[PDB]
Amino acid sequence: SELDQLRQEAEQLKNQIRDARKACADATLSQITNNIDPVGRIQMRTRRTLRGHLAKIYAMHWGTDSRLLVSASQDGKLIIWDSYTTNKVHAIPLRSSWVMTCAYAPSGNYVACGGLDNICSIYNLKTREGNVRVSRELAGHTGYLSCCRFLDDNQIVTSSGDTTCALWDIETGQQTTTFTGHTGDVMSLSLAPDTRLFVSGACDASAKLWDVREGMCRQTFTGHESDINAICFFPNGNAFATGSDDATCRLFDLRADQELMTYSHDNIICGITSVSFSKSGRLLLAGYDDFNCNVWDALKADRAGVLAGHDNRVSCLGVTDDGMAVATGSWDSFLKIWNGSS
Amino acid sequence: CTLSAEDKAAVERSKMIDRNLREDGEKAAREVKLLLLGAGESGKSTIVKQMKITTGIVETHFTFKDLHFKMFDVGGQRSERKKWIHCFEGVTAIIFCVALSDYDLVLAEDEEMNRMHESMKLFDSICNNKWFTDTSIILFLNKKDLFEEKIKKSPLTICYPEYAGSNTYEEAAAYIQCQFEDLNKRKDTKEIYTHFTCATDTKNVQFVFDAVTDVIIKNNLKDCGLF
């Protein structure tokens, strides 16, 4: 038979890859970092509280100027906040109220959203009239849209529940590239700082690294036991972190091609909803189902602090580009800005 | 008192936005939201047509006796249900459609599991969900006329080995309804409203209206502490 031959060849290739990875694992990161001082105890306080949403908040995203942000709720509203003064700049009503993601253009001129309607809608913020209007509606996915990120004013990459990712052209509305290879729903994606590669995580408990220009998969990372809900990229672009339903976070290195550290505790038995890094990459922030956020020493895998103050799930969090504040959204319909105290 | 003129103008704009948001929320809070479910083809489109008279999620709006309904149909979502069912946590009620003529048909996948036993599994999964612990279910049992004819040709013992055996519509309908209503475990905080669907298009919206009115009244009594 030929099916058995191909299955055996695939198994042999998997064994060869496992042996090649095991060859280069000489010492663990804990042993290497057992000679650096602990970060200490991290304490943060709530500076602002943004109210005005009437239902669960599902996503948020910072602007590149570290002052404006956009948030999406299932009451059918996108809201743009000025965080310094708490003022609302724009409120945008959506045609479909089942939104699950939102994005902010790095130029500051456009916003994007999508959800259970399988469509990514683009909104223009700078018009001769005083209103915000829809610019384009990208359609072509056969499952719910779970994430979207801008590359420039004319390019955007999305992940769908039909086990696929896509790179679009906003001016024409056509899919420029398609990324297939996952066997489960793709739940998140993250762009590298140079925007030449991106990493995705799916419900088959695996993550993948994709080349944007050539449109193929270079590397596949496994090790989790359940679905991966969140993914983030290390500041220097050579590592990334994943959060999953098995109540652990994990760190992967691109050049070593394997997992470096696991962040878990015996008192945590809930899934991770969101994950992010600090400006230097020393701290890792993760949001959980048990209503609070945990701060981890990335290099030593120790707990360092807790952000508490929400009455329901922490569904989204983000860190500014200058690293001055954190933002957390929640199912209790509030957003909070957090800062450290000298 | 330390705000420049443009700062005050921006604050005024923000206040106007707040007012509009509050008005929109007040308008939207006075509507009934229903989630429509069923296993495969079970007359669900027929029910949609009865109440009324690719895109992911389908919404139908209608009015009956000065009350506004919003019915959500999610049959086009072929992805994992576990990842988006919690979006419907706060609906008023779930309308579950079941075809009575499927008691002897077999799904053409394994040729071993008949369609009715798949509908029972779906109903068990939805009724005992953790997101729907206090949500009422309106159960529609469709195709009674076809069931009446099919009773004679095929006995109900094909689907239920433990049936006592009457081989009549009156007893078979009661047996099937009892089998479906027996799957509700926490039968103290949840109710089931059962209806045998008729051809006429006016006796179904009335039943939905009555059930929704009962649900709203009980919610208000529970809120006031009287229930």
Epitope: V89, G130 | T2, A5, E6, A9, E12, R13, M16
Partner: single-chain antibody, 234 residues
């Protein structure tokens, strides 16, 4: 396109009354605050009145308080100025101006065409433009200076100075808002800088359409004073 059209001018005997109308088209009228500004014959600009978005705030100049009333009608997209007991110093051309206020916006960015009105026979910030006329030739570079009596720099990083240019036989046009930013549709040759009280506007090159009068305005506090502009000659 954005349009503001004015009506209601003409000849009026002293002590009479008149109503001026301003009809808007092509933009979301209800979300903009609106201003009435006027220009006396062979003189400079002078702010008159302001009505906010939603008509929750109203401001008048001290020289017209008690005789002028500003109002808006949003369903029909109209702005009205009703004026009574008209003295001989009210003969002028009137302009309808739109402005919107949020973080990052550009107020005063569109002006109407104006209508003419002929009448028969205290702690305000002073804005000073020393030079009143300049001859110049194409291809060169020009600097225009403006000075203030108060520091326009607020304690939030913003300096509230605006630049306008009026070509002969035309309405004024915005060039620079908040002392550094460039308006939409304006060439990149123009630039602005300053400090506290002294401000400058520089034209890196020069063309044949830059002739006209240049005005500096302050928006730190009402009554929103102007300064007598500088005329550029060929």
């Amino acid at each position: 396109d954005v349009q503001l059209v004015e009506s209601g001018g003409g000849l009026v005997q002293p002590g009479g009354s008149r109503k001026l109308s301003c009809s808007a088209s092509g933009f979301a009228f209800s979300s903009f605050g609106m201003h009435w500004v006027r220009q006396a014959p062979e003189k400079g600009l002078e702010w008159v009145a302001y009505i906010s978005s939603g008509s929750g705030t109203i401001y008048y100049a001290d020289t017209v308080k008690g005789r002028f009333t500003i109002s808006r009608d949003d369903p029909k997209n109209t702005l009205f100025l009703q004026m009574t007991s008209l003295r001989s110093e009210d003969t002028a051309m009137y302009y309808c101006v739109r402005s919107i206020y949020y973080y990052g916006s550009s107020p005063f960015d569109f002006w109407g065409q104006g209508t003419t009105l002929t009448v028969s026979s205290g702690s305000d910030i002073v804005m000073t433009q020393a030079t009143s006329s300049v001859p110049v030739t194409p291809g060169e570079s020009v600097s225009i200076s403006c000075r203030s009596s108060k520091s326009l720099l607020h304690s939030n990083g913003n300096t509230y100075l605006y630049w306008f240019l009026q070509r002969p036989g035309q309405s004024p046009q915005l060039l620079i808002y908040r002392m550094s930013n460039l308006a939409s549709g304006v060439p990149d040759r123009f630039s602005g800088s300053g400090s506290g009280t002294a401000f400058t506007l520089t034209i890196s090159r020069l063309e044949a359409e830059d002739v006209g009068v240049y005005y500096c305005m302050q928006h730190l506090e009402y009554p929103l004073t102007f300064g007598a502009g500088t005329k550029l000659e060929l």
